[PDB]
Ligand binder design. Sequence first.
Ligand SMILES: Nc1ncnc2c1ncn2[C@@H]1O[C@H](COP(=O)(O)OP(=O)(O)NP(=O)(O)O)[C@@H](O)[C@H]1O
Ligand SMILES: Nc1ncnc2c1ncn2[C@@H]1O[C@H](COP(=O)(O)OP(=O)(O)NP(=O)(O)O)[C@@H](O)[C@H]1O
Lengths: 443, 443
Amino acid sequence: VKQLLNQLGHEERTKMEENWIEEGKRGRKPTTISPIKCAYILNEHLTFILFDDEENTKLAMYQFDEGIYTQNTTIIKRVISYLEPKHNSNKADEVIYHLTNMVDIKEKTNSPYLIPVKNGVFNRKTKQLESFTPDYIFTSKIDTSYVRQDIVPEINGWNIDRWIEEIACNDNQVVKLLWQVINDSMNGNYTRKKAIFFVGDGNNGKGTFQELLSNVIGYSNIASLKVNEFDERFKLSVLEGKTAVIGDDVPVGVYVDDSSNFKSVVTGDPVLVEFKNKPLYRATFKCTVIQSTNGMPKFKDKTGGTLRRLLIVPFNANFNGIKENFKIKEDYIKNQQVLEYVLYKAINLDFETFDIPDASKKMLEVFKEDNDPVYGFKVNMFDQRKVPKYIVYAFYKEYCDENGYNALSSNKFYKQFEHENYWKTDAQRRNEELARIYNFNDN
Amino acid sequence: VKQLLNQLGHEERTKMEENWIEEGKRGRKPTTISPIKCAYILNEHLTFILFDDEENTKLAMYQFDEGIYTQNTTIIKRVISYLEPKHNSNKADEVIYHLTNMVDIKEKTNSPYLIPVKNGVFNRKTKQLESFTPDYIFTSKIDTSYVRQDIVPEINGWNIDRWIEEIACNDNQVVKLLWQVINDSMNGNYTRKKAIFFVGDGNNGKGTFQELLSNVIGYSNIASLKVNEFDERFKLSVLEGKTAVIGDDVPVGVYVDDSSNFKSVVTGDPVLVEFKNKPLYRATFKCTVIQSTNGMPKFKDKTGGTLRRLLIVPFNANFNGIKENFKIKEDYIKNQQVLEYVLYKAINLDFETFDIPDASKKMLEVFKEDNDPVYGFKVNMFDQRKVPKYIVYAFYKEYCDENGYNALSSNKFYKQFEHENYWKTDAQRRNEELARIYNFNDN
Ligand SMILES: Nc1ncnc2c1ncn2[C@@H]1O[C@H](COP(=O)(O)OP(=O)(O)NP(=O)(O)O)[C@@H](O)[C@H]1O
Ligand SMILES: Nc1ncnc2c1ncn2[C@@H]1O[C@H](COP(=O)(O)OP(=O)(O)NP(=O)(O)O)[C@@H](O)[C@H]1O
């Protein structure tokens, strides 16, 4: 590209001089290509597009070697210097401005079936790799190269697939889910309407797995934001061009006062996002949610909407008793051969809905008991009754022995919402005892 | 208009060159049309207007293909480049300033009887489609095309009307209300002084209906604001150019402290709005309010205005039990034929006041009982008594089993304000018992 523009610039400069020689020394000497002329040359011999007609849209250039469109002005301005090095920043801006008016408007290819990779675009419908073309409008791509892998790479006798088995404590469902998680992470146009949480007390490898995703996927392609930080001002601004969002560390049992922004991103509904000192606008994020926490956080919603969105990974394995291998976190996951195999296996994996492991379901039920004290009381009933409201209330087994405040007769309406027998009214059965109380089961 | 402007610019440049030849080589050579001449040519051969005479008003250009006036400076500057490509940003701004000085001032057509649609304007008085003309000043239009529909479109054997029936659990009143809600949503100049709230326990399809509305209407034409976010600073600024506002998710039972701006927007009264780092100004919003919540929120007003402004949609249907059809939310509602049929049926529907379903009336009454403890106690009275204030008080049936703080006698004044028998004072009937108390009904 640089060699092409350098030849074009010299040819155009020579042509201008020849015309000036033909007209004689009228004034000074034309040695600098005019900014409008530069736009004419660049548009002809390069691919400049405009993403949309909205005001102050930045010009996008298709850099041939990378195969993706870029809006970086410095990259574009460097290209201007190849054609006309004598242009300063103001004149280069004039060249950019002229190109903005000239170029046609094309929208970014947001097809979920296409995933850009360093080697080229990957079409999930055909499960085939396609070479970079200007027709595919992409602004970012996965850093790792896509090559066909037949044998699992081994570095110092360490197997990446066995490491995944070690992380999941040799659980077939979890390792299947973990591969599905990596598959969903790379695709930035399909969200699958699920949120992934990593729960580990300590040294469970959550950070290494996050660093693995940060390595197989581009470093710039990932976002760092916690669950409680989604609703803060300007925090959603970072998720503009991110394929996925990773929560490096979530506070233990943090109270998510408002999960509306979190729930919208997980489902994929449009959310209100504002850049700092910039006007508020509306956009849709399809990136998946990855969060690492040392314990399931508490959500104020206590509704079915939050429950369906959440997915939990057990991470039962501990690396404290076993000797810590800093080589895994620092070197092994950064190996190119290891990364390429992970990319090849994950992107080739095809699935429609997240295959929920039984361990996640059991641990998800634990969170439901923790989140809703009423549901925990229903689970912990273990009783063979409906007519006496005070008996079935029983102060909810003394706060269900959890020290969580419970309303009076309001959660009772919420209780029957949770649950065949429903409500039966009998005057005989329905204040024998105030009930603190050790009568776990009556007659 | 690109061809016309190119020809005009070439002709003007040729005329200037001929004039310079007539005057000889006085100095250099005139090849760039002066900005004032460009403004003259554009005003002669295009339609530029100014919405109002207030300071720093942006010039509006009638783009012929779209049929609506636009204030986007990039489009106008692209038009300038079509006329004279060699102007940079500064000279384009000079042309825009000259045009602003030249053009006349016309106000936007805010007639509620006219609804701009992609094909053309729709007159509700005549219920007829009219082609685009510069006479109608519109800044935005409905994205979907208006075509006459005779048969309900079917994609993969899925019927949109049957989907609406399924959403409303085969309730004629609720589906009629939904069609009326869509009809109100399309019109951005008539507010009808009602607020629509979607309540759903689980997967009730509220998000799918919101996406359907955002698809039939223009994506840029909808605002994303929740109720509790109405009074947050700079949040109303987005509402200026939106036909309707939709809250994607509302926290379950969120305590909306201040509802003044929300009530004003629902009624349509003028409200004070401020953009970030921009002067405060008073503006009138006629957009309709649609909100999705997993439970009816609470308002501190306990006033008739909040009750009369609010309208609730049951959404009793649940898609958690029936297998979820992701194609409904992802693909089927994005079908052009389905969107066109929905547009036609909704815009052709004619009604004056929101036909409130009986289910909404019962659910609205349940919200009224929840909002005011005194009203709920009065409903739960079921008693055959007026003279003893403490007896009829009964601590409001001991908080009415809803742990709501109640005034000792101010709420009594509020009760007698709400409610034939009124008050009768008798010394005989009026401290037998302190009254906690199980005497539900006395003699
Ligand atoms: N298979 C393995 N065997 C032994 N040590 C390992 C293995 N995989 C990773 N490690 C080490 O275990 C540590 C994992 O750190 P990390 O994942 O951050 O712990 P964590 O507390 O669970 N995550 P975080 O809460 O963000 O700190 C690193 O020192 C790794 O080098
Ligand atoms: N008729 C239908 N039959 C089955 N599934 C449906 C039907 N209509 C929609 N769905 C699916 O049901 C889901 C609707 O999601 P959504 O409307 O967001 O649930 P919601 O909780 O009520 N709204 P929200 O609170 O914002 O999440 C999507 O997965 C749709 O594909």
